[PDB]
Amino acid sequence: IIEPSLKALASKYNCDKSVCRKCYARLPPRATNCRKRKCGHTNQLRPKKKLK
């Protein structure tokens, strides 16, 4: 359908991220602190929820 070789390439920019638990910011997958001033550069993070 979409030749899943590209999905990993495509998901790495859209799905393979991490989310700040306070300001819902989109972060790199291996981030330790959120890069946003309002949330106080908090360390509380969650992975971006995947399909299925």
């Binding site: 359908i1 390439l9 495509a10 998901s11 859209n14 399909l51």
Partner: protein
């Protein structure tokens, strides 16, 4: 803690020539010449043996010292970019609607045309930064190559067309359509 001395090293290849005034750097290489400004960091420069340039900060703080290594990488990319060049291969991702990407020149601007993205009737035009070469390279399906001397223009323009193809009002985790960078390398890689 005011490190009284900090030093990082700038190796100079054979064929290049480096001209550095106060904070205006001029690198001359086979593929061209690249320059920019650095007057916003207050660093010193030292020529050693025509093949090695030294950069130092005296009595620098944590942030000040960290800025030095940024320049070390930054000017190095000029040297790499002027000897080997910069090549950014760029891949399409489409599920149902093939994306028609062409090159148009209105007023000689050499625009990049995007069509049929999610079946949209809108056409998205991305200007080509000067010094960046566009290649509808064959033998690999649905890929474009951007090449140039300065990594900044090559990288930013590559990112520019990436951002112009975002998807709105839909689940990006499902609608993976777009154009995404697949390979960052050198024009004269493996040389």
């Amino acid at each position: 803690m005011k490190y009284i001395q900090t030093e990082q090293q700038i190796e100079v290849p054979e064929g290049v020539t480096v001209s550095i005034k106060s904070r205006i750097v001029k690198v001359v290489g086979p593929r061209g010449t690249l320059t920019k400004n650095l007057k916003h960091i207050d660093v010193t420069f030292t020529k050693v043996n025509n093949q090695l340039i030294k950069v130092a900060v005296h009595n620098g703080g944590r942030k000040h010292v960290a800025a030095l290594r940024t320049v070390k990488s930054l000017v190095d990319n000029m040297i790499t970019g002027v000897t080997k060049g910069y090549k950014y291969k760029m891949r399409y991702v489409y599920a149902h609607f093939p994306i028609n990407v062409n090159i148009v020149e209105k007023d000689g601007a050499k625009f990049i045309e995007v069509r049929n993205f999610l079946g949209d009737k809108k056409i998205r035009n991305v200007p080509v930064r000067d010094g960046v070469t566009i290649e509808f390279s064959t033998n690999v399906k649905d890929e474009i190559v951007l090449s140039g001397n300065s990594v900044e223009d090559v990288s930013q323009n590559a990112a520019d067309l990436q951002q112009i193809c975002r998807v709105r009002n839909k689940d990006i985790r499902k609608f993976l359509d777009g154009i995404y960078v697949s390979h960052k390398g050198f024009i004269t890689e493996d040389l």
